[PDB]
Design an enzyme around this catalytic site. Structure first.
Site, mmCIF file in Angstrom:
data_model
loop_
_atom_site.group_PDB
_atom_site.id
_atom_site.type_symbol
_atom_site.label_atom_id
_atom_site.label_comp_id
_atom_site.label_asym_id
_atom_site.label_seq_id
_atom_site.Cartn_x
_atom_site.Cartn_y
_atom_site.Cartn_z
ATOM 1 N N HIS B 41 9.514 -1.796 -0.853
ATOM 2 C CA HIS B 41 9.740 -2.091 -2.154
ATOM 3 C C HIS B 41 10.105 -0.794 -3.065
ATOM 4 C CE1 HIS B 41 5.731 -2.957 -3.728
ATOM 5 N NE2 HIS B 41 5.991 -1.910 -4.474
ATOM 6 N N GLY B 143 2.022 1.389 -10.709
ATOM 7 C CA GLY B 143 1.854 2.927 -9.870
ATOM 8 C C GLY B 143 0.973 2.927 -8.447
ATOM 9 N N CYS B 145 1.020 0.699 -6.043
ATOM 10 C CA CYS B 145 1.454 0.253 -4.832
ATOM 11 C C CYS B 145 1.366 1.303 -3.670
ATOM 12 C CB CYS B 145 2.756 -0.356 -4.614
ATOM 13 S SG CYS B 145 2.656 -1.889 -5.691
#
Ligand SMILES: *[C@@H](CC(=O)OCC)[C@H](C[C@@H]1CCNC1=O)NC(=O)[C@H](Cc1ccccc1)NC(=O)[C@H](CC(=O)OC(C)(C)C)NC(=O)OCc1ccccc1
Ligand SMILES: *[C@@H](CC(=O)OCC)[C@H](C[C@@H]1CCNC1=O)NC(=O)[C@H](Cc1ccccc1)NC(=O)[C@H](CC(=O)OC(C)(C)C)NC(=O)OCc1ccccc1
Lengths: 306, 306
Positions: B41, B143, B145
């Site tokens: 993503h 932030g 991920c």
């Protein structure tokens, strides 16, 4: 979101752990630059743990009495001194992995991470608070002495605790990195007991702010309290008295949630008086007291889930 | 003694964290050998997070579309592939700090440590369980991920989780390091909800053994139960059914404390039915379900405080 007891990343501390052996006693040491720090009780004789005279025990040792191991590498001891309840062993090699570091004496109520170690090998990491009675509620077995407590600010390690003993309630006692004990304790196996503990009021309150930041308001109420009226209830429930300094410390959290501190105190007074009615706060049924306002600001969003 | 939620020391994982940027989206990546792993993503356009077609988005990228940073060093991307919900970015440099490692898919009920990271910089470490509903109760902000979950066995890192999303109950979802989601979740911002969760019976029981090892027996009783009678009560309280395999896993703990598993089950059945009567177990008022039997054996003394 979420809220967890969070430890600092332990890698900068892992690179500093060694094993120190005097005779048949082995424990952990901390290697910074060309010095290894460890509990002085490493020099205790097996049959004299009750009344050791450390000055007398230490003068009977040489540099080669001490064996220091970093992984598989023997570090040669070339000097030694006692500092309060620690030994400082000077070694032939400066630790190439020495981080920026400070030694700090932490204050009751403040938190830190512990790197539990055995035979110079780190095994686990968890967060602890310094209790008002100067013990910590740690998790330590035989072999754990010399394990250290620390905080990290930017890339500087603030070492604040080295582990020395366990008291009969199953709680833990130790020193700062100058070797001075936290609390009235002494490094001998003579009877000693932690003083009665108190709940850390400032932290319970900080954690109520966390619960609000994270989106829960169930425990708030329409009331307010004076500082003095609050403290009458606090004494009743074995909570530390709240001070204006504590109120000023909660400033930023208060500002972020729109909840005045004394309104939060009123909320807490109602929780003490009425209980939680089978409800939880950030997943917990008890009032948690091991997160500082600093810890809450570090972990929570800067933006309240309104 | 003592009992704490204990994370693995995080240093071997810290040396593997990098920042990965595609356009104005930055998140964390994991750098092992000459490969960087990160959530796919990272390639999502700001206005198309609902229905991204990743094959279509990815073919529009080159190697130089990706910016990888390890501390202050730019790592040049020289190849890329998608693997399920992750990207594998091949880089010009092999990580000099790559530990021995494995990729593992963990099973519901098992625990692991999470190294929360932001902009490729580790900020905290805590222990999580994989819930039966395939989420974790973590602590993650924007932030986070690409932050990873792991266990350590000897000096081998078993990576088991990379973080991808937060669901509306405030719980967390992600993948193994092959990029397959834990649970039925998909990496798009279309409505999704965790299935209802269940209490991890095996762990509650393991933790009751821990409490005994550590010296407390208050909750035991004179009774026994059949597996089947136990499970009738378990269904009532939203506990996972207990299986003979679970009973066999508790073997060693049972042996160490002298408590037969089904006697421990009877004890637990009484706790469910009657509550704790204002009492605590290892400092807790709730029945804790995020310690495995492995976790208890790892942390507790091999010798029961009888
Ligand atoms: C670390 C030292 C090590 O690496 O292992 C020791 C073989 C160890 C850490 C604790 C062990 C279990 N969990 C721990 O946190 N420290 C000690 O064992 C320490 C050693 C010591 C201290 C001072 C001089 C010489 C040696 N001793 C203690 O913690 C003792 C433990 C204990 O329970 O001892 C008795 C059996 C009760 C005597 N604690 C202690 O002495 O507390 C004071 C006391 C003494 C007698 C009655 C009540 C209280
Ligand atoms: C990590 C990505 C990152 O580094 O920051 C993103 C800017 C981030 C981690 C979570 C943020 C807060 N705490 C976390 O754990 N991941 C995301 O933000 C992830 C990004 C994504 C995923 C898939 C495709 C494109 C982008 N998105 C989510 O976690 C969203 C969060 C959310 O609350 O979004 C809404 C505002 C509800 C749409 N979660 C999500 O979409 O869950 C499914 C869903 C959607 C709509 C209704 C209910 C449930």
């Amino acid at each position: 979101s979420g809220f967890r007891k969070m430890a600092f990343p332990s890698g900068k501390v892992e690179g500093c752990m060694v094993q120190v052996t005097c005779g048949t006693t082995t424990l952990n040491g901390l290697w910074l630059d060309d010095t290894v720090y460890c509990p002085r009780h490493v020099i205790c004789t097996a049959e004299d743990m009750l009344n050791p005279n450390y000055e007398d025990l230490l003068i009977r040792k040489s540099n080669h009495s001490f064996l220091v191991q970093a992984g598989n590498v023997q570090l040669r001891v070339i000097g030694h001194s006692m500092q309060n309840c620690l030994l400082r062993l000077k070694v032939d090699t400066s630790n190439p992995k020495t981080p920026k570091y400070k030694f700090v004496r932490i204050q009751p109520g403040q938190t830190f991470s512990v790197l539990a170690c055995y035979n110079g090998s780190p095994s686990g990491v968890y967060q602890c608070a310094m209790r008002p009675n100067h013990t910590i509620k740690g998790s330590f077995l035989n072999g754990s002495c010399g394990s250290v407590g620390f905080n990290i600010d930017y890339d500087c390690v603030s070492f604040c605790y080295m582990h020395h003993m366990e008291l009969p309630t199953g709680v833990h006692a130790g020193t700062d990195l100058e070797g001075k004990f936290y609390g009235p304790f002494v490094d001998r196996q003579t009877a000693q007991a932690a003083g009665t503990d108190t709940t850390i009021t400032l932290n319970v309150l900080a954690w109520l702010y966390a619960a609000v930041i994270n989106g829960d308001r169930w425990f708030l109420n329409r009331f307010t309290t004076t500082l003095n009226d609050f403290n009458l209830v606090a004494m009743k429930y074995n909570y530390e008295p709240l001070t204006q300094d504590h109120v000023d410390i909660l400033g930023p959290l208060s500002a972020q949630t729109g909840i005045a501190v004394l309104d939060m105190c009123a909320a807490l007074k109602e929780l003490l008086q009425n209980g939680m009615n089978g409800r939880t706060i950030l997943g917990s049924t008890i009032l948690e007291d091991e997160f500082t306002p600093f810890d809450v600001v570090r972990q929570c969003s800067g933006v309240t889930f309104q």
